[PDB]
Design an enzyme around this catalytic site. Sequence first.
Site, PDB file in Angstrom:
ATOM      1  N   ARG A  41       2.711  -6.432  10.008  1.00  0.00           N
ATOM      2  CA  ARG A  41       1.899  -5.457  10.732  1.00  0.00           C
ATOM      3  C   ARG A  41       2.272  -5.427  12.195  1.00  0.00           C
ATOM      4  O   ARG A  41       2.195  -4.381  12.838  1.00  0.00           O
ATOM      5  CB  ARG A  41       0.416  -5.764  10.566  1.00  0.00           C
ATOM      6  CG  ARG A  41      -0.041  -5.551   9.139  1.00  0.00           C
ATOM      7  CD  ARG A  41      -1.383  -6.178   8.933  1.00  0.00           C
ATOM      8  NE  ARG A  41      -1.868  -5.870   7.599  1.00  0.00           N
ATOM      9  CZ  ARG A  41      -2.647  -6.676   6.891  1.00  0.00           C
ATOM     10  NH1 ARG A  41      -3.021  -7.852   7.406  1.00  0.00           N
ATOM     11  NH2 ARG A  41      -3.037  -6.309   5.668  1.00  0.00           N
ATOM     12  N   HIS A  80      -1.438  -5.369   1.437  1.00  0.00           N
ATOM     13  CA  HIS A  80      -2.596  -6.187   1.153  1.00  0.00           C
ATOM     14  C   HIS A  80      -2.137  -7.503   0.600  1.00  0.00           C
ATOM     15  O   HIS A  80      -1.186  -7.545  -0.156  1.00  0.00           O
ATOM     16  CB  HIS A  80      -3.531  -5.538   0.122  1.00  0.00           C
ATOM     17  CG  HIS A  80      -4.557  -6.495  -0.399  1.00  0.00           C
ATOM     18  ND1 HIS A  80      -5.775  -6.684   0.220  1.00  0.00           N
ATOM     19  CD2 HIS A  80      -4.500  -7.397  -1.408  1.00  0.00           C
ATOM     20  CE1 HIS A  80      -6.440  -7.635  -0.412  1.00  0.00           C
ATOM     21  NE2 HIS A  80      -5.685  -8.090  -1.398  1.00  0.00           N
ATOM     22  N   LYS A 130       0.825  -1.200   0.000  1.00  0.00           N
ATOM     23  CA  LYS A 130       0.000   0.000   0.000  1.00  0.00           C
ATOM     24  C   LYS A 130       0.873   1.269   0.000  1.00  0.00           C
ATOM     25  O   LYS A 130       2.042   1.217   0.382  1.00  0.00           O
ATOM     26  CB  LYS A 130      -0.950  -0.029   1.201  1.00  0.00           C
ATOM     27  CG  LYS A 130      -2.008  -1.126   1.127  1.00  0.00           C
ATOM     28  CD  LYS A 130      -2.922  -1.110   2.362  1.00  0.00           C
ATOM     29  CE  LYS A 130      -4.312  -1.687   2.048  1.00  0.00           C
ATOM     30  NZ  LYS A 130      -4.874  -2.551   3.167  1.00  0.00           N
TER      31      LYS A 130
HETATM   32 CL   LIG Z   1      -6.773  -5.476   3.122  1.00  0.00          CL
END
Ligand SMILES: [Cl-]
Lengths: 112, 112, 112, 112, 112, 112
Positions: free
Chosen positions: D77, D90, D11
């Site tokens: 993350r 993603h 992203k």
């Molecule tokens: Cl996502």
Amino acid sequence: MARERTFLMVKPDGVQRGLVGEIISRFERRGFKLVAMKFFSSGPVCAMVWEGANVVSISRTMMGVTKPAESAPGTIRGDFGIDVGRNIIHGSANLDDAAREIALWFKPEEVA
Amino acid sequence: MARERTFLMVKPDGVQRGLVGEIISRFERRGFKLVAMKFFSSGPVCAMVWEGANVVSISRTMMGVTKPAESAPGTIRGDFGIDVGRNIIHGSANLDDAAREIALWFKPEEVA
Amino acid sequence: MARERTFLMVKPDGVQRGLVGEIISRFERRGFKLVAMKFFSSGPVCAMVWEGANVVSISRTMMGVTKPAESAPGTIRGDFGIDVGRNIIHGSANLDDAAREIALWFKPEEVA
Amino acid sequence: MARERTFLMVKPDGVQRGLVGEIISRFERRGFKLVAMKFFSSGPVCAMVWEGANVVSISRTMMGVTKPAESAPGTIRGDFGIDVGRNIIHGSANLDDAAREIALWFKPEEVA
Amino acid sequence: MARERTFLMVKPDGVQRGLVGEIISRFERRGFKLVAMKFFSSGPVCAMVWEGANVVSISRTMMGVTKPAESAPGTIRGDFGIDVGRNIIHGSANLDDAAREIALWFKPEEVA
Amino acid sequence: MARERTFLMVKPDGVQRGLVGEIISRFERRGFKLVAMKFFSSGPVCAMVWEGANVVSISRTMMGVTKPAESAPGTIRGDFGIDVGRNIIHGSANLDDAAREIALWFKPEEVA
Ligand SMILES: [Cl-]
Ligand SMILES: [Cl-]
Ligand SMILES: [Cl-]
Ligand SMILES: [Cl-]
Ligand SMILES: [Cl-]
Ligand SMILES: [Cl-]
């Protein structure tokens, strides 16, 4: 000759880019004992005093040359430096600049 | 003078050894903006265009010298290089070789 | 000319500081095949034989110069060295010192 | 069952923070073969196709859960995530979402 | 209860992929003292004995579960594992398997 | 709800082992803004205030559980922890313990 001490400071651009830890780690790995630390124009900074044999000239080698276009890979500026404006870090030039820079930035109780 | 751009490519041996990410990280850490990227004789390659002040000569410093027997630790070839056959990576030699190498490998829409 | 082999040893100070893995990784990343290894005055040591083209002089470059005050960042001593007393690591000086150092420290079955 | 393939994309926030290389390295280290890659609302992205046994569900584990407040350290993350808005990366949810996401983002020649 | 010891071994696939150092570093960082080490079907291996409180069950946690499809990121298999065939590393299952595995692989002089 | 702040401190064992930088880096990478820092029984410590959404409970996850025998790899204690005596680091338990711990250790001017 091993009670030697320098001033180091992560400039606002170093702080903003998340490089404080990386910079400290570099010095911890060389064996320098951290002696004092505070986190104070535009952007916050991280002022540190480090101690060890030859710490003053060694840490200058570790930083690399003022002009990161020419800074050696392995050095802080060689690995992370942008341009000469945003050169990440400051370290005392010599033993006189160290003693003055330390005292400017710290109360003497603040230093070990 | 900061719109400057070079071509970089991870040779098949770099790809096969799992070094694409490591190579990119090196450039991200110096502050270069990635501008285009594709993953195309024997082995797949990763072609990239990178942008920043002096990116052309800086990235050559970052790679190290052609002969990894002599390549400086801290550089890509200095840290990862095998022999001169398997020298991991290619980067444009100068500003002319960059413009030509970019256009050879990309459609112009593909580049930012 | 690629069957070439050197002796390497993590001095007690390298072992005590937790640097054995880091040192091995450095050599694995250059592509040298480890050939033998044992973990034997004051402190334990890690003796290793490594193999590859030019491994003898390349690994000396990789270590840095004897005097870590002058050792280049990127090298082992440049990244981790303390003073010349505690200089972390030993590596054979030349092809003759290698053959002798290997045989001194190993039985020949122990070596690949 | 090892010809399996997923879509992955860094992203804009991952790109802006300099994490493309780190993300790729993570996958290279697990043994997944990169198969295609392009660097295309607000911010550039890095779209990738990766291949290997169970790559679809493994890479989801590798990313961590949608809500980085709860994301496990070791995951992308968990190590780098900010909030759920800026969740870095993603990856396709399942084998159907993978086949559709790949075809949406690539010409079929572009994929190995 | 801190004189506790386990057997660890880098399988041929760990050695071939250049992960010996990384594996050692992981244990050095947890504080385990390395006690013995040798570098002996198809591919060379690296056998090690490590010592510390709870080293047996802790190191199993550190490795991750047998099935790297399910192995947690942060663990060795979670970061580097391929499939269950090539699962990188072996570590003793319990205190009995440790004592037996150590003695099988070492002469007792070889162990500290 | 993003003006949230916690107290963190590298215990003497963290400092002595050279882990201050590593600990800071971990937090920088999650996106937390460092807000204050000082380097003050037996051994020096590094007290810090960090700020961000959910920083209090997230940083506890990041540290791992009190008992590093059980601490998850990827967490600080999971990667670096020794025993429960030498558990490296302290972080405020909850929002009340944070406000009290911050004020105990800092003058209010010292905090951003
Ligand atoms: Cl996502
Ligand atoms: Cl300056
Ligand atoms: Cl070339
Ligand atoms: Cl020597
Ligand atoms: Cl097993
Ligand atoms: Cl506590």
